[PDB]
Structures are given as C-alpha cells and as structure tokens.
Design a protein around this ligand. Structure first.
Ligand SMILES: [Mg+2]
Ligand SMILES: [Mg+2]
Ligand SMILES: [Mg+2]
Ligand SMILES: [Mg+2]
Ligand SMILES: [Mg+2]
Ligand SMILES: [Mg+2]
Ligand SMILES: [Mg+2]
Ligand SMILES: [Mg+2]
Ligand SMILES: [Mg+2]
Ligand SMILES: [Mg+2]
Ligand SMILES: [Mg+2]
Ligand SMILES: [Mg+2]
Lengths: 73, 101, 119, 88
RNA sequence: GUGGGAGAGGGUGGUGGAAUUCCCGGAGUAGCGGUGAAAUGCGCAGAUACCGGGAGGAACGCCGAUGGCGAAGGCAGCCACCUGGUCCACCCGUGACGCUGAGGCGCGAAAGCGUGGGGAGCAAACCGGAUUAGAUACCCGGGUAGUCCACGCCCUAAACGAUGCGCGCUAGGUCUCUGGGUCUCCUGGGGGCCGAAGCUAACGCGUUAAGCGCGCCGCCUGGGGAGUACGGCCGCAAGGC
RNA sequence: CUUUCU
C-alpha cells in the first residue's frame, strides 16, 4: 500500500524554498539520501519540484546526505 | 543590482584568531567586489551529512548581499581561493514559497 | 594470533560466486574465504550452498584470531547472499548488525553491452 | 536584460503623444533595442543558435512593421529610420 | 504597453557527490573472473575480497511521471551570468500593419571527414577463448578508430504523429501540467484516454480531426530495372541533391 | 547454450 502517512501531513507550514531547514528537509529523504516519491512526500508537482531543488542545494552545502547505507537485509 | 545569499563553510578547527581572520578577508572581498551586506546569520559549527575535506564537521557563514550581478561569479572565485574556505555558494534570493499552511 | 574479538564481516555476493572477508574494527582483513577457497571450481562456486561453506570457513578462520562479535556488510545481489548471512548468524560469531551497502553509480560509466538495454 | 527604465525611457522617447504605447514607431523602436542587445549577445556565443532564431524573427517583425509604415506615412518613415538609426 | 507565471529551451564559466579504471600505502592468501558448460585471461613481482590516500575522464542515481521545454534535430546533478520562445490578467496603445510561401539564408540525431587536444568506461575493425558439421556470428577474454572538447566540414534517418501551415465552424465525459477567478467549480494555454455528429476500404480519427469549410506551399500517378545511368550543382572524402 | 534442410 504505502499509506503509512504523507510526510507533508505530519508537519506544519514550512518554506519549501529554504535550503537549510535540515530539520524538516531531513523528513523528505528515505532511509537513504533518496528523495521520497510524491506518494510519500504527499507534495505536488510544483512543490515536489521545488523540494528536489532545495534538497540538492543542501546536499551540496553538506547539510543533507547523498546516500545512506541500508540497515537490515 | 540583485539580491543574493552567499554561503560559506570553513574549516571547523580555526581558533578565535584565524577564524575571525577569514571573516576579515571575506568581509573585505565581499566589499571589494560591491557586496553591500544586508545582514548575516552565523550558525557556526554543524554536523555534516558527509565529510568535507576529511573534516566531519563544518563552520557555516551566511550573508545576504545586494551586488552588481555582472560580478557575482568573480566574487566567488575570490571567496573559494582561501584554503579554509571549503564551500561557497551564492544564491539568487527568492520569495519564500510556503506550503502546509 | 592477534585476538581481535570484534570487527567487520564483509560479504561480496554476485551471480558468479560469493566471497566473505572478515576484518578488524577499522578495515584491515583478518581472513577471507570464497567459493573458490573451498572445493567448488566453476559453476558451483556461485551456488548458495558454496556461499554457506565460505561464510563458515571465513568465520572458523576468524575464530583463530579469537573473533566473537562481527558487523556484517552485504554488497551486491547474487546466487546466495542471505545464505551467507545465515551461515554467519550461526557459526559462532554474534551478528551485531547487518547492512546492505551495495555500490550504485549516480550514472557514470557506460556498462558493457551485457548490462545495457535498459533505461 | 533591459530594465523597465531602459524600456519606458524608449517608449516615451518615441511615442507619438502622451499615452502612445504601441504606435508603429514605438514598436519599431523597442525592437531595435532588443535586436541590438541580442545582436550583441550573439557577437559572442556564436553557438547559441536557438537564440538566433529569436533574432531572425524580431527582425522580420520589424522590417514588416516598417514596410507598413513606409506604405502609409512615408514621411514618418524617413523620420523614424534616420532617428532609430536603421538600414545602412 | 503594464503587471505576473512555468519551464531538461539555448550559450559561457564555475562546482558537487556516487561509481569504474590507474597509481601509492596498510592489512591479508590462493585464487579471481567468466559460462549453458567451459576456456582464453588476470594472480605468489601477491591478484580477488577490505581500508586509507591520489590522479583522471565520462555521465549525472533518487526526485522522474502517465510530467515539462523547443520549429525540428533535441534538451535532464547544482550555481551565476548572458539569451530565445510561450502563457495568463488588465483591456491601456497602433488600426488590417494579416496568411502562405517557389528560389534564398539559417538550423539540422548518429555515423563519418580535416587540424589540434583529451582518453576512465565502452567499443566497428582486429587479436584470442568457446559453440558448431562449418562460426568470417550469436556467448567469453582483450582491443584501435571512435565515443569526449575546440574550430571547421558533412546534411542523412522509421529526421514518425509514417498526419505541411493559418483561421472559422461542429455533444459531451475523464485524467493531467501551467495561469487567472467570485477557487467543493468557472475560465485561458498545453498534454493524454473514452466518445455526439460526421469521416474512413477497414483499422481507426473525433474541439490536440483523419469532421465541415476557405487560403497558400510540397508531393503521388502499377511493380521490378532504380534512388541506379546520364548531365548538372554541392563535398576534402565518404557521399548528398 | 547452439540445434540446418524437407
Ligand atoms: Mg525567457
Ligand atoms: Mg483600447
Ligand atoms: Mg482611433
Ligand atoms: Mg549533423
Ligand atoms: Mg558525431
Ligand atoms: Mg575528428
Ligand atoms: Mg572491454
Ligand atoms: Mg567483446
Ligand atoms: Mg485541453
Ligand atoms: Mg457515430
Ligand atoms: Mg478516439
Ligand atoms: Mg569535387
């Protein structure tokens, strides 16, 4: 299914343009520096589109990861 | 002129002196190029997602200036020159696109 | 003959043969086994059974340096990987944690023909 | 780019009367502006073909507007060209 | 014109991390690799698997789509500069200034060519292993041109929607991207699917027409010979028209 | 794996 809970839902109004709120951005990455799909980010074309750009600017600065190791398997 | 946001990440192992010295050359250069400082935020040390120059931490600077766009790129060649400056990123300022509001 | 007690267990699976390398708490390999190391020479080398025997021998050889606790790290998908992990889980060693760390490119080198036809 | 200042400065500069935003003159004026800036940009970036088409169209639009002007008021025409500094 | 908008549209410079290859160091042995099986091949001058450092080239995971942009070819890491197109609102200005477009000029995937540079991975040719009755192939191990950059040339294609461009007219339904609105829907632009009328040989098309009309362009006239011969024009050549 | 012709 994948209906655990939209990331957007569990959250307040934040500035999607802010490439430093590592606090919240941290929320749109999976158990890997991978940017969550819309059916998880619960965002929308436009938003989801600016999210991605933000997240990347961060990764570069060094605030967000590019990729994590999976802990299980 | 346009409003930009400069990002700087230096070596988190600089002593009171060296550290404030870098801010010297920086504050200097910013002006030397036409950067009119509209304000600053200095979070300082932060845990990097991944190591930047073996160093697993970083010292972050953040200034929002107003400068002649025709020189932005040079202003950053300059900033990158310093050895303790390990990350530079100039961004065009933008209205904060909210959501979940 | 060093007595390490705790360290890493790297498991390199592939459709062509598994190969386990046990290391110390910071990377330097203590011992290593594989489908080759044990009997099996060609096709069988890959097989999940082999993976088992390799995982064991890898550990047994490790019990020499007095190993006890290990952190497993799996790399790649292939003919018996979870097998190799079960073997270790038994053996003697205590499996503190397991981790999929297979390397993926963010798209760099054109894969040889045999691996193209995708996108 | 072309600042709003740079723009209106031209609109007023050519307008036929206070309020004239789109006379044949004002238009031919503004085009010549964009054209020259662009003609400039391409003196460099000779490989920016995609932008060149744009120019190719701005010109057409202009020479087409002038054709019309000549036909209607030949006076304003000679008047405009000489001014803007077109032809040659 | 004024005010807004989305965007892998184009050009220059900069820069980020993942991975491969190579080199250095550590630790560590007898294999690794590869297949349907194998072998060639690499490894005790110590390979594979593991860690740390370095050099270099090329591409840009997730987001990513059923998505967007462009006239087409095509265009996706991030940043700045330069720059093209397009859409909406207000209805403010000019007052038919419009459409099409033989020839012209320009653009034009890939391969290819010329000079110079670059060269990690991949890889025509080629050098080997295997399979086979044979294997000038498919599979395996290597590998040069090339793939990359620059400047110049080539101009082709299933260059496809196999559907020239513009305008008007003719039920709706549903999903979608972007703008406005009195924003559980209305309205404009764009992408999809199902369908009225109608059209079609049928398949299907159906306000994104292949329907009803008007304007302008290009093209067809049984198959093979043949996109060949001849002539001409273009190209360094290959070759193109 | 391959696996021609009638
Ligand atoms: Mg634009
Ligand atoms: Mg009016
Ligand atoms: Mg009037
Ligand atoms: Mg071409
Ligand atoms: Mg080419
Ligand atoms: Mg060449
Ligand atoms: Mg090869
Ligand atoms: Mg080959
Ligand atoms: Mg529509
Ligand atoms: Mg019907
Ligand atoms: Mg239909
Ligand atoms: Mg000739």
């Amino acid at each position: 299914p994948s209906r655990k809970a939209k990331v957007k839902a569990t959250l307040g109004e934040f500035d999607l343009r802010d490439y430093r709120n590592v606090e919240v951005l941290k929320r749109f990455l999976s158990e890997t520096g991978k940017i969550l799909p819309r059916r998880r980010t619960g965002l929308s074309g436009k938003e989801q589109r600016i999210l991605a750009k933000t997240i990347k600017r961060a990764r570069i600065l060094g605030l967000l990861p590019f990729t994590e190791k999976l802990v299980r398997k | 002129m346009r409003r930009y946001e400069v990002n700087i990440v230096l070596n988190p192992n600089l002593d009171q002196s060296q550290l404030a010295l870098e801010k010297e050359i920086i504050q200097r250069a910013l002006e030397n190029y036409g950067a009119r400082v509209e304000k600053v935020e200095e979070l300082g040390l932060r845990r990097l997602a991944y190591p930047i120059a073996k160093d697993p931490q970083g010292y972050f600077l953040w200034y929002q200036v107003e400068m002649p766009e025709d020189r932005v790129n040079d202003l950053a060649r300059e900033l990158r020159i310093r050895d303790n400056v390990r990350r530079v990123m100039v961004v065009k300022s933008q209205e904060p696109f909210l959501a979940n509001a | 003959k060093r007595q390490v007690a705790s360290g890493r267990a790297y498991i390199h699976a592939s459709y062509n043969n598994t190969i386990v390398t046990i290391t110390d708490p910071d990377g330097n390999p203590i011992t290593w086994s594989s489908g080759g190391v044990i009997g099996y020479k060609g096709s069988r080398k890959g097989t999940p059974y082999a993976a088992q025997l390799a995982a064991l021998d890898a550990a047994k050889k490790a019990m020499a340096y007095g190993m006890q606790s290990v952190d497993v790290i799996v790399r790649g998908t292939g003919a018996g990987r979870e097998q190799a992990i079960r073997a270790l889980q038994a053996s003697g060693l205590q499996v503190k944690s397991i981790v999929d760390d297979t390397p993926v490119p963010h798209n760099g080198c054109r894969p040889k023909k045999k691996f193209r036809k995708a996108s | 780019p072309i600042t709003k200042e740079e723009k209106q400065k031209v609109i007023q500069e050519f307008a036929r009367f206070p309020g004239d935003t789109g006379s044949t003159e004002v238009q031919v004026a503004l085009l010549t502006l964009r054209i020259n800036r662009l003609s400039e940009h391409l003196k460099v970036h000779k490989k920016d073909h995609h932008s060149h088409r744009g120019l190719l169209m701005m010109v057409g639009q202009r020479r087409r507007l002038l054709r019309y002007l000549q036909r209607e008021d030949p006076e304003r025409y000679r008047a405009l060209i000489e001014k803007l500094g077109i032809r040659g």
